[PDB]
Design a protein around this ligand. Sequence first.
Ligand code: ATP
Ligand code: ATP
Ligand code: MG
Ligand code: MG
Lengths: 485, 46, 376
Amino acid sequence: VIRKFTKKNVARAKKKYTPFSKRFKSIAAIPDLTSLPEFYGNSRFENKLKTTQKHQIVETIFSKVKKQLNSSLPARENEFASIYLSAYSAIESDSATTIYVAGTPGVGKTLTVREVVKELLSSSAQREIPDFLYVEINGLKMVKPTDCYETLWNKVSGERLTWAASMESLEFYFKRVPKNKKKTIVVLLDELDAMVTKSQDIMYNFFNWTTYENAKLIVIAVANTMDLPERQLGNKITSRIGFTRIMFTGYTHEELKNIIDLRLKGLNDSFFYVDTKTGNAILIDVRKVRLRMSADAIEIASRKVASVSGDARRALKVCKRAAEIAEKHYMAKHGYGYDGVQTVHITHVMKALNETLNSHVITFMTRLSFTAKLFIYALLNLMKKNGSQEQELGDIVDEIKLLIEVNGSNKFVMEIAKTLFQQGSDNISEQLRIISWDFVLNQLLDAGILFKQTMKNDRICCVKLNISVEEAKRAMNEDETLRNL
Amino acid sequence: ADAQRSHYTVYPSLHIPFVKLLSGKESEVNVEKRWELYHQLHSHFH
Amino acid sequence: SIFLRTKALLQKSSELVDGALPARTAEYEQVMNFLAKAISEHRSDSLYITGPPGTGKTAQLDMIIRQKFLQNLSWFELPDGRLESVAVTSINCISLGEPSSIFQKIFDSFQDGPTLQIKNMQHLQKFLEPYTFVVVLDEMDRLLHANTSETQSVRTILELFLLAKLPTVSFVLIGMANSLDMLPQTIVFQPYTAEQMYEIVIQKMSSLPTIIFQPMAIKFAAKKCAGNTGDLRKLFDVLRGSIEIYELEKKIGLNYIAKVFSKFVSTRTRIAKLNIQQKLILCTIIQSLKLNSDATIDESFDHYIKAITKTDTLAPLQRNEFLEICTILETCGLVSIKKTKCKGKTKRFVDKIDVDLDMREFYDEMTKISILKPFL
Ligand SMILES: Nc1ncnc2c1ncn2[C@@H]1O[C@H](COP(=O)(O)OP(=O)(O)OP(=O)(O)O)[C@@H](O)[C@H]1O
Ligand SMILES: Nc1ncnc2c1ncn2[C@@H]1O[C@H](COP(=O)(O)OP(=O)(O)OP(=O)(O)O)[C@@H](O)[C@H]1O
Ligand SMILES: [Mg+2]
Ligand SMILES: [Mg+2]
């Protein structure tokens, strides 16, 4: 038969369509799912990425410092206690509950929740509480937002079903199955804002299963914002999530110090056998070298990060960047390759902090050609003349022509007018646009300095500055020629 | 009420449309013969 | 313990422990005046229940189905005592693919047998014509069709509520919905009052050996939770959090209820923690949203560099530094930053500043400092 179109790349998973409510003949016929081989969880790729080294690589003194500062809990004790007490009471009373946690990035939400469920699993290993199943659902790690329905049911039953069948199965399992035939499930919903669809059915279902009497379900919902339910969710879901919500504040600088010095307990103020032939250092031709990080360097890093964000990732990356700068300076002076006392002091931390804060924008427009800077200068002149923050391109063409023909006594303009309008030939006729007109316009568009409107008339098309006018004039004043006229 | 519906089907409960002329004093066979004359002329036209 | 048992009974998933909720004894009779009327005479009528969230609508209707009641055939004991026939189902409408399948969802509850294709009101009507049938529809708001104009959005609900009144068919349709999230007889579940919440709380706590709360604490919690949103879930959460704060910090009392409301709920203190350099940035930003009123960072920063050159107070700083102080005002709670397409001839995405801090307390904190008064 003749097809109107073809779908030759369809890849369909092997997932059944029959839900759990039809799996048994009656409610009384459902067995103990805890005593089932495939229920409640009762790494095939990790050998793929291995090879032989055939080399002994050099690990300098700063390498152990840089590995100790990677993201891969002295300051989270009240939040740990609250989350642990709520989850513990819900587990050992066979209750269903929702624990809401919100915060800015890198303040330790995921780490605290994972340590809470680790200590809960340790409690259930010694029979202080009934045994439970732990499930992680990250909303940013799903292809489709409905795949969470597929994931949780697969973690509960071992079945592979499609998403509507999975959510029917989960609805039947939480609602109708008796408690004595079930197990407690703790579900971490990480990145909750990613699980928000147009119709909020996933959020309603996940928080409404926690209001079922038989469910034995605990949902730990981790969100960006305290008032995410009030901003983006319905009143029923906001009622079901609750009024009691746990805020993870940004870290103060004493806590960022505590985190960094907890990362630097075993190598800060310690000795190394350095082997100055290669620089490969071994922790206790060969010298005993003390390594230290300055406490005031950690102080200024922690103070800057705690004022700006309180992010632990940012503080660890700042200290790691400082160690990288010190290691680059160290390997420059010896030529150690990769195959006394060395200190990560204040200035490395300051150079690491300022390299994220210095702007390349003014440096970028400084090193442009004459024609691009002439474009920017004419656009600034038109912006101050007619007061508009949006200028027609034909006006910019006429302004460039006017600035060339008015400042015709300038020596640079005398030297460059023939280049700008004839490419210095006297065989090319006089042009209506300058040489490299479309080039510098497209260059300022790729850089994001300019915005242009989608019109096909070139003269009446408008152009806007996407950067600050003060930055543009500061760039234009650095040039010797354009600051004169 | 089906008058508030968009569409509905009806199956109602349960021989020529020509009526008796001459102030109601036409013969019944004149009516039938008029019906057949119209039918033959209309068929001969179409 | 008893803290554990009180905490378990104060959850939203708690067990419902002759057939009316403890503060709902009016509305239950109203539903009885819908049931014992239309079950006996076999009429076709439609009920519609409204209310704010957590007013007991699902709980009361589930108690009615549990205690006072083809697959779902039951006996209804009449006030006359005839014990007449009724098939009752209860469908939450959110766990449904499309709204237009609800008629099919009505069939799969009331079917042993043959499986027919029902895609309209007509098929379900002609299936229910040769026979009564009671369908409780929770979350009626899910039947609305989005993005399909005002008339055609209510398409399925008009079909359901029209077939719910049609002659010689036997259909009672009870539809509960929530008012904040959105002819049949309308019954409203009003939000609970503090005396009703006290009644509910002592009746739920009656199964325990003792009540661990002081009663002024329970009445204070009930009064602080009631109002225009009398949501019982909020009161359960407040009392559960009071037990939790007691357990962490160690009868309950009033101070723990007040500490719940202190922990789980201000622009004077935010300004007072800032550096004079940071305080000038906040003054310029609210001044920047006076002239433009939809301005970017680079338009707010352009205004800030204007204010400095006519005043010469503090050294003028760079744009990136301006943004991190603006990011400093993110993490203390004054400046808010979003991203949307700008309104103009060019439509591409820009970052903007919005400010909602109380303006009454902003002018009080800044007029005390003399050098900042040019920047208001
Ligand atoms: N209290 C802490 N003690 C030690 N390290 C911490 C602490 N908090 C955060 N970190 C470090 O910072 C990293 C980021 O923390 P985490 O993943 O928990 O952040 P998050 O709050 O969930 O943030 P995001 O919203 O970006 O996901 C951790 O993996 C850890 O290396
Ligand atoms: N009168 C009452 N006595 C005891 N518990 C009650 C009472 N009313 C409600 N509850 C309890 O309050 C909780 C929420 O009530 P319910 O689910 O019935 O609210 P609702 O009005 O249907 O709200 P929503 O629109 O959010 O579904 C349940 O745990 C229920 O048992
Ligand atoms: Mg995280
Ligand atoms: Mg309800």
